[PDB]
Amino acid sequence: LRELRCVCLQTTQGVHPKMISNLQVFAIGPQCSKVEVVASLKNGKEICLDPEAPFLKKVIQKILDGGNKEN
Amino acid sequence: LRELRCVCLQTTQGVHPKMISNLQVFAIGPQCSKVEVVASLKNGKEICLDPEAPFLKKVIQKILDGGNKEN
Incomplete structure (x- = not known):
């Protein structure tokens, strides 16, 4: 517990x-x-996105709603 | 490439x-x-959920609405 x-x-x-293929969300x-x-x-590869952008x-x-139609 | x-x-x-505090989407x-x-x-811990259930x-x-409400 320093930095x-x-x-x-x-x-x-x-x-x-x-x-994109894998989305990891952390709270x-x-x-x-x-x-x-x-x-x-x-x-x-892994990148970071800024929620600040629309x-x-x-x-x-699209990767959240589309991951429910394919059954 | 077998099984x-x-x-x-x-x-x-x-x-x-x-x-829940983390969400991972796999395609x-x-x-x-x-x-x-x-x-x-x-x-x-890590579990698996069935997208076939409402x-x-x-x-x-709810983890998508509350995960973007924090400013």
């Missing part, structure tokens, strides 16, 4: 959900009081 | 979002041709 950094130090301005923790939405591509809510919305 | 199992073999019938892969929604509790869509819907 802890948020999981996401930087941001990103993507893109289409077409490249408020002991290292970060701000919610950060991380994503992983199909190639095998387009961000769109690409993350 | 791969879905990330979620079983299901669950929870509960309240109050216990179609080489092990599963179906979308499965996994979650981790604040206690340090009540399941509720507890997972």
